[PDB]
Amino acid sequence: MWVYRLKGTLEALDPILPGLFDGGARGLWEREGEVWAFFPAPVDLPYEGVWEEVGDEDWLEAWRRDLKPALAPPFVVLAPWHTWEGAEIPLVIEPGGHHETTRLALKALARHLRPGDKVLDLGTGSGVLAIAAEKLGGKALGVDIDPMVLPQAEANAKRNGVRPRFLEGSLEAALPFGPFDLLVANLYAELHAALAPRYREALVPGGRALLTGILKDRAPLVREAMAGAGFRPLEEAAEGEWVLLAYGR
């Protein structure tokens, strides 16, 4: 589809709106003192608007403009352009916080992390959990096997005024910086089950593992593997079909 953009408000352009619809407009939007009229293809119009074809960039931009802060107590997840007036701890993250598992992990982190604790965020992605860990007074390393995500993780951190360490790799790559007081891992059940004995090795005695990305029907696999590795269960929570399991070492 194509947009015909006109300078002015809907109120001001009221006289010509019927003409736009007569010409085949199927949508109208007022956006920052312009009216955008949407058509299957350009047609001859006497209104001195400009034609442009709508692309993926336009969809992404419109959706981004519609994003709202996402609560994840004690945090609020914000886009870089959001303001926040409340008491919640802000976490500013470039949109790719809405996800159930990030909400679960942030809540669990606030409960199990203590100021001064050394944290491993395994599969850091956007860096959100490592960044939250720093905001809570922890000292975080975020690792990801995908090096491509790390520059954005660093940018997010800077925007939040904290500096976790970010590294390319998996669990093996983190061990040199260990052992850790707490590991948080938003992965999936089968991977947690495989990694359980290495989780034990990554953590000090008395340390914590917060595991999410677990589908409810796969939770038994994780309970079994974590018990096998000598962890004790502390807390469970769910949102939608997703669970977080918290363990002590």
Q: How many residues does the chain have?
A: 249
**Which architecture, in CATH terms, is 56-96?**
Up-down Bundle (1.20)
DSSP secondary-structure letter at 217?
G
Where the chain is discontinuous (C–N > 2.5 Å), the residues before each break are 96
H/E segment holding residue 115: none
Q: If phi over 0 gives left and psi between -120 and 50 gives alpha, with beta otherwise, what is residue 235?
A: beta
Q: Taking the alpha carbons of 168, 169, 171, 176 in that order, is the dihedral positive or negative?
A: negative
For residues 28 and 17, what is the distance between their CA atoms, to the nearest angstrom?
Answer: 9
Residue 86 one-letter amino acid: G
Which of 207, 212, 165 is CA-nearest to residue 182?
207
H/E segment holding residue 236: strand 232-239
**Distances from the Cα of 212 to the Cαs of 78, 117, 167, 208, in angstroms?**
22, 20, 21, 13
Which of 43, 47, 92 is CA-nearest to residue 70?
92
Torsion of CA 73, 119, 242, 230, to 10 degrees: -130
Please report the resolution in angstroms. 1.6
Domain 1-55 has CATH 1.25.40.10: no
Give the residue numbers of the binding site for S-adenosyl-L-methionine: 102, 123, 144, 170, 186
Give the residue numbers of the binding site: 102, 123, 144, 170, 186
- Give the residue extent of every domain in the chain: 1-55, 56-96, 97-249
DSSP secondary-structure letter at 224?
H
Method: X-ray
For residues 199 and 94, what is the distance between their CA atoms, to the nearest angstrom?
Answer: 29
Residue pointed to by tokens 């001859």 = 44
Rounded to the nearest 5 percent, the helix, strand and coil shares of the chain are 35, 35, 30
Q: Taking the alpha carbons of 194, 198, 202, 204 in that order, is the dihedral positive or negative?
A: positive
Contact (CB, 8 A) for 104 and 237: yes
What's 97-249's CATH class?
alpha beta
Residue pointed to by tokens 């590294």 = 167
